[PDB]
Amino acid sequence: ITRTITSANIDRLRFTFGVQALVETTSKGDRNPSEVRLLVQIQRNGGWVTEKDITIKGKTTSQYLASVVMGNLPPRPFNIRMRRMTPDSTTDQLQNKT
Amino acid sequence: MQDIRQETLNECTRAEQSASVVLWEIDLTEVGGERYFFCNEQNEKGEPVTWQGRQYQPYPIQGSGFELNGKGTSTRPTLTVSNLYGMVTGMAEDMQSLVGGTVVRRKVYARFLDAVNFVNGNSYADPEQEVISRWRIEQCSELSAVSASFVLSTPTETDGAVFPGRIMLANTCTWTYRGDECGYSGPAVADEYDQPTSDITKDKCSKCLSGCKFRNNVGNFGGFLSINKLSQ
Amino acid sequence: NGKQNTYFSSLDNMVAQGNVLPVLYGEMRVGSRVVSQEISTADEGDGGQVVVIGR
Amino acid sequence: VPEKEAIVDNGAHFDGEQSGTVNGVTPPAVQHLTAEVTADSGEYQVLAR
């Protein structure tokens, strides 16, 4: 997902991300935690730079939302994006949606 | 002990002495007027008394009550000067009651007075011998057609002073405009009612946050914002 | 309850509005007037590029 | 001096809002309310966050 920033006077930027669930169900019915990774990117200079490395690990069947704060923002015409480095789940038992 | 010159002390210890002359200088430079020199009596030749080059003018003036005591309250001497001809009335209506000016008192023995005064001259003239004390006018206790009376005070008086003296306010800036603390020096921007203007004569700060934002000087705001939320 | 006070020491945090800004002249423990105070949720990032959430 | 009445009446210029109800001290609503029913411990429980 990508969006751009147009406001003139801002000093820091906060990204609120999360996962809908992370429970992993075995064939018998046991539940185990899983993990997922994200990248938050800002277009400094001419190439995208990954500001942060994010890893969420645990068991939950409801949304868990976390926030991280940025700084040293480039000049305003910059744009931002977030991307996923974990392969999209194919089996229905995995349930790790970013 | 004041560093009085030796010849003055030798004059003090003598059995028979020369006349003692008190010379008054009223300084209105800080207020905005000119300095005035007076003396109680004329010289021997019927001319104004000459000390150094000042040429103090004859005029009925007297000051009584001077003292050196720090145990109790301040001294507050009194000075009386006549205004039969209306001089003091004109200085009082021009210079706002002559309140805040300096009064300087000198005591010089007639022996050391300038040679111009005496008809035969003075062989002992020495312009360095005097005793000086400074005061500041405080009030005009009386003013009539006969005389006018002032009460002096020390320059270092502590009547209306509280020490820390700086108030933390939520909405008002305490600095002086364009002062050292405010640190603004630029084109005229606004009036005291946050109305745009460009004349330099009517450029004042409203001491409000908008009045400060007109100058883009929010960084140096005197007051501390959003305290009233906490105090509540 | 009989605690005795003096004019040159204060060890607790006082309200800000309408009060003077104090002056400190020597080495001493101080409690100071509060200009701001808030409670919010804390960000997970600790300032580094790598951040790990959960176990 | 009768001329001081008009000087006193003119008041001053105040900055802000007379109502001042945009932001008092009433707390806002809690951000993310979620309730989860888990039978992992062998019993039905509700976890509010």
Ligand code: SF4
């Ligand atoms: S409000 Fe701003 S511009 Fe006005 S005196 Fe205070 S610091 Fe200076």
